[PDB]
């Protein structure tokens, strides 16, 4: 099958899924390759072609540093890129149901990776189950990460910042101009993303240039008000200069700095990225979104507080154990290979690692709030406290504050709390329901019975896929047929959320109320 797009014809491939057929277009380009004089610049328009483009295999993933903290360990390496790294990586993928739909709702996926890593060709990001089972069209794109995507000299168009976000935005533009030719409705487009991807989705809610490119939005374990998500103009400039010094590109004319960095090999930029910050944590975002004056016209906390964003429905949620994954990447006493029982002194050492530029009193307040033991004789007490500190501060409390702030302006919002630790995961049990552990359930991998998942997990993923699809089509994430718990809207007063698990789906209220009042009200002062 061939499809005629605004820039030329493209050829796809057929996929047998669950006794049916999905058509896949892997690797359509959506911008001029950002090479040479184009490195660090906004993505440039793609000039037509007269031939048939073969969209039949995933394209190159963008340049990035690979995670090698556990070589040969599937739990980390399944997130490493699975196609060639290259600066020529501005490509996207399309999964359309067969037979060609007539006006299908589109789901657009934005992967995370701390704004430094990630790629849309990962196995857990395969859109074919969602297209087969729910008849939505799934789209995903590669966008530039790290310094190649977010190096910032604010004002200077040679390196204005936010290039990865403008990559995402240009791919959404492609969906507006082209997806009807695939049988999709450009007027029913839902963005969804996880971690830095979720943060990216929330920034598309703020950026006026994105407001007409999508309908609704789904935020999984991530939002732009998280402490890691937005870099100040101060830090962005300092870090760009630290990178120029690290590569001998230090000049006085700032444009001549950008020209000097353009002649460095992609690798040489990648190797020095890590050292532009003085103190780093497992959650560092060396090069990330900034207030560029273009994509972000003001500091996003101000735009949230004052209601400056797209008015629409949102679906937001978090996992029970967001913080645990990061503890084995540097906290003393922790290991994926033992139950990581830490002492009080090890907990305090852990805080120094995750809170380097915090005052001494700051660290003492975290200690005080989180070690008032109900039972001090539990040896996992400190182990669990440090995970909860990292998870509440970095993910859960910013997600709730974003949802409260957002709903206060009249829009329907739905909040979930994902608490299933799946059956086949390679990380140990003490890490619980880890960051990223819901992606496979959202994409419907447990719907594959040969994939070593339990039956309860197939049921959970089936219900989640239905709710996500109903949210994208209708703005309302119910499973209306199989006698399911209704999912109430999240209001600022009552703060009802839905829990997702294989046992009992429950309505609860005011998630982490005492912990988030600490982080969101007391702590930012320090
Ligand atoms: C495809 O459907 C759209 C309408 O989509 C629905 O309405 C949206 C506002 C949004 O809520 C979606 O989730 C819905 O599924 C049709 O749009 C109409 O287009 C005509 C042009 O002929 C226009 O005059 C109408 O005002 C539009 N209706 C709207 C905006 O509701 C569109 O034509 C459909 N196209 C095909 C080929 O089926
Ligand atoms: C759990 O292991 C940590 C990490 O130690 C490493 O991984 C282990 C699985 C094993 O292969 C060790 O030999 C490795 O060093 C242990 O913390 C270490 O403790 C030693 C003293 O025994 C100390 O010298 C190291 O600096 C520690 N390493 C770190 C990263 O803190 C920890 O003691 C183990 N915990 C439990 C409860 O068994
Ligand atoms: C891939 N991997 C990773 O990239 O996680 C980071 C790394 C740095 C971050 C900095 C700030 C904010 C969030 C960050 C997240 C994480 C890492 C820990 C837990 N499993 C396994 C390894 C992954 C979860 C995941 C999967 C896809 C996208 N995201 C996260
Ligand atoms: C693009 O692909 C064309 C056809 O691909 C081949 O034929 C189809 C029917 C499938 O079986 C497919 O897997 C085969 O590889 C080629 O003829 C054409 O040269 C390709 N264009 C390139 C490589 O630039
Ligand atoms: C950048 O930050 C580093 C670390 O804080 C510091 O040493 C340096 O003075 C800052 N400024 C410049 C211009 O390098
Ligand atoms: C910096 O370089 C640019 C690009 O060549 C040039 O237009 C500008 O005059 C230079 N400015 C200074 C102060 O050297
Ligand atoms: C509803 O229940 C039936 C069995 O009674 C099951 O096969 C089906 O997939 C379920 N659907 C959803 C959307 O959960
Ligand atoms: Na209550």
Where do the domains of the chain lie, and which CATH numbers do they carry? 1-526 (3.40.50.1820)
CA–CA separation, 440 vs 378, rounded Å? 33
Q: Which residue has the tokens 């209704």?
A: 486
Nearest CA to ligand 7 atom 1: 482
Q: Is 361 exposed, middle or buried (0-12, 13-18, 19+ CB in 10 A)?
A: exposed
Q: Is 195 a catalytic residue?
A: yes
Q: Are 291 and 230 in contact (CB under 8 A)?
A: yes
- Strands ordered across the beta sheet of 52-54: 2-5, 8-11, 52-54
Q: Are 56 and 93 in contact (CB under 8 A)?
A: no
Q: Resolution (in Å) of the shown entry?
A: 2.5
Positive or negative torsion for Cα 201, 203, 207, 209: negative
- Ligand 7 probe mutation, 462, 483, 484, most atoms within 8 A of CB: 462
- Ligand 1 probe mutation, 135, 176, 187, most atoms within 8 A of CB: 187
Q: Is 435 a catalytic residue?
A: yes
Both structure tokens of 75: 């739990």
Ligand 7 atom closest to 479 (CA) = 13
Largest CA distance in the chain: 72
Q: 238 CB less than 6 Å from ligand 5?
A: yes
Note the ligand closest to the C-alpha atom of 27.
4
Q: Are 488 and 500 in contact (CB under 8 A)?
A: no
* Residue 249, phi then psi, degrees to nearest 5: -95, 10
- Ligand 5 probe mutation, 236, 278, 280, most atoms within 8 A of CB: 278
Both structure tokens of 131: 């297209």
Q: 250 CB less than 6 Å from ligand 5?
A: no
Q: Are 57 and 25 in contact (CB under 8 A)?
A: no
Taking Cα atoms as reference points, which of 493, 407, 502 lies closest to residue 464?
A: 502
Torsion-angle region of residue 233: left (phi > 0), alpha (psi -120 to 50) or beta? alpha
Residue ranges of the alpha helices (H) in 23-141?
74-77, 128-134
Find the catalytic residue in 195, 210, 221, 407. 195
Taking Cα atoms as reference points, which of 198, 120, 127 lies closest to residue 435?
A: 198
Q: How many helices, marked H, and strands, marked E, lie in the chain?
A: 16, 16
Residues whose beta carbon lies within 6 Å of some atom of ligand 1: 102-103, 185, 187-188
Taking Cα atoms as reference points, which of 256, 137, 126 lies closest to residue 185?
A: 137
Nearest CA to ligand 1 atom 29: 187
Note the ligand closest to the C-alpha atom of 337.
2
Q: Are 85 and 61 in contact (CB under 8 A)?
A: yes
CA 509–ligand 8 middle distance (angstroms): 6
Ligand 3 atom closest to 199 (CA) = 12
Element (H, E) at 163: helix 163-178
Q: Which experimental approach was used here?
A: X-ray
Q: 436 CB less than 6 Å from ligand 3?
A: yes
Both structure tokens of 53: 């483009």
Q: Is 256 a catalytic residue?
A: no
For helices 381-391 and 360-370, the axis angle rounded to 10 degrees is: 120
Q: 114 CB less than 6 Å from ligand 3?
A: yes
Note the ligand closest to the C-alpha atom of 462.
7
CA 470–ligand 7 middle distance (angstroms): 15
Q: Residues near 506 by Cβ (< 8 Å), separated by ≥ 6?
A: 485, 498, 499
Residues whose beta carbon lies within 6 Å of some atom of ligand 2: 332-333, 335, 337-339, 341
Nearest CA to ligand 5 atom 4: 278
Taking Cα atoms as reference points, which of 103, 130, 294 lies closest to residue 218?
A: 130
Nearest CA to ligand 1 atom 19: 187
Q: 325 CB less than 6 Å from ligand 3?
A: yes
Q: Residues near 514 by Cβ (< 8 Å), separated by ≥ 6?
A: none
Find the catalytic residue in 204, 369, 420, 435. 435
Residue 390: C-alpha distances to residues 193, 303, 429, 495 (Å): 21, 26, 18, 23
Note the ligand closest to the C-alpha atom of 279.
5
CA 253–ligand 6 middle distance (angstroms): 6
Ligand 1 atom closest to 473 (CA) = 13
């Amino acid at each position: 099958i061939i499809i005629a797009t605004k820039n030329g014809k493209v050829r796809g491939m057929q996929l047998t899924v669950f006794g049916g057929t999905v058509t896949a277009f892997l690797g359509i380009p959506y911008a001029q390759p950002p090479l040479g004089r184009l490195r660090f610049k906004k993505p440039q328009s793609l000039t037509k072609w007269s031939d048939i483009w073969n969209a039949t295999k995933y394209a190159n993933s963008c340049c990035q540093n690979i995670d090698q903290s556990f070589p040969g360990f599937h739990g980390s390496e399944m997130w490493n890129p699975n196609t060639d790294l290259s600066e020529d990586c501005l490509y996207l993928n399309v999964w359309i149901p067969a037979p060609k739909p007539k006006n299908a709702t589109v789901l657009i996926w934005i992967y995370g990776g701390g704004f430094q890593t990630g790629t849309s060709s990962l196995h857990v990001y395969d859109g074919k189950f969602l297209a087969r089972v729910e008849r939505v069209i799934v789209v995903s794109m590669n966008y530039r990460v790290g310094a190649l995507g977010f190096l910032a000299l604010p004002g200077n168009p040679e390196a204005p910042g936010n290039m990865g976000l403008f990559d995402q935005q240009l791919a959404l533009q492609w969906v507006q101009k082209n997806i009807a030719a695939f049988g999709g409705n450009p007027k029913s487009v839902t963005l969804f993303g996880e971690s830095a991807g979720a943060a990216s989705v929330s920034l598309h809610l703020l950026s006026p240039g994105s407001h007409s490119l999508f309908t609704r939005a789904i935020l999984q374990s991530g939002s732009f008000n998280a402490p890691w998500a937005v870099t100040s103009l101060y830090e962005a400039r300092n870090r760009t200069l630290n990178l120029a010094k690290l590569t001998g590109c230090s000049r006085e004319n700032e444009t001549e700095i950008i020209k000097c960095l353009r002649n460095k090999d992609p690798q040489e930029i990648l190797l020095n990225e890590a050292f532009v910050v003085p103190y780093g944590t497992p959650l560092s975002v060396n090069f990330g979104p900034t207030v560029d004056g273009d994509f972000l016209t003001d500091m996003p906390d101000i735009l949230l507080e004052l209601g400056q964003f797209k008015k629409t429905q949102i679906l937001v949620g978090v996992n029970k154990d967001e913080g645990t994954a990061f503890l084995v990447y540097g906290a003393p006493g922790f290991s994926k290979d033992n139950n990581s029982i830490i002492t009080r002194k090890e907990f305090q050492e852990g805080l120094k690692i995750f809170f380097p530029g915090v005052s001494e009193f700051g660290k003492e307040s975290i200690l005080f709030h989180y070690t008032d033991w109900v039972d001090d004789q539990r040896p996992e007490n400190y182990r669990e406290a440090l995970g909860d500190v990292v998870g509440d501060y970095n993910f859960i409390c910013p997600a709730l504050e974003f949802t409260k702030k957002f709903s206060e302006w009249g829009n329907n919002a739905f909040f979930y709390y994902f608490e299933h630790r799946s059956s086949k995961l390679p990380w140990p049990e003490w890490m619980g329901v880890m960051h990223g552990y819901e992606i496979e359930f959202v994409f419907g991998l447990p719907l594959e019975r040969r994939d070593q998942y339990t039956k309860a997990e197939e049921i959970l993923s089936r219900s989640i896929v239905k709710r996500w699809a109903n949210f994208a089509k209708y703005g309302n994430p119910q499973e209306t047929q199989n006698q399911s718990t209704s999912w109430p809207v999240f209001k600022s007063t009552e703060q009802k959320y839905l829990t997702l698990n294989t046992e009992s789906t429950r309505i609860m209220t005011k998630l982490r109320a005492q912990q988030c009042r600490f982080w969101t009200s007391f702590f930012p002062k320090v």
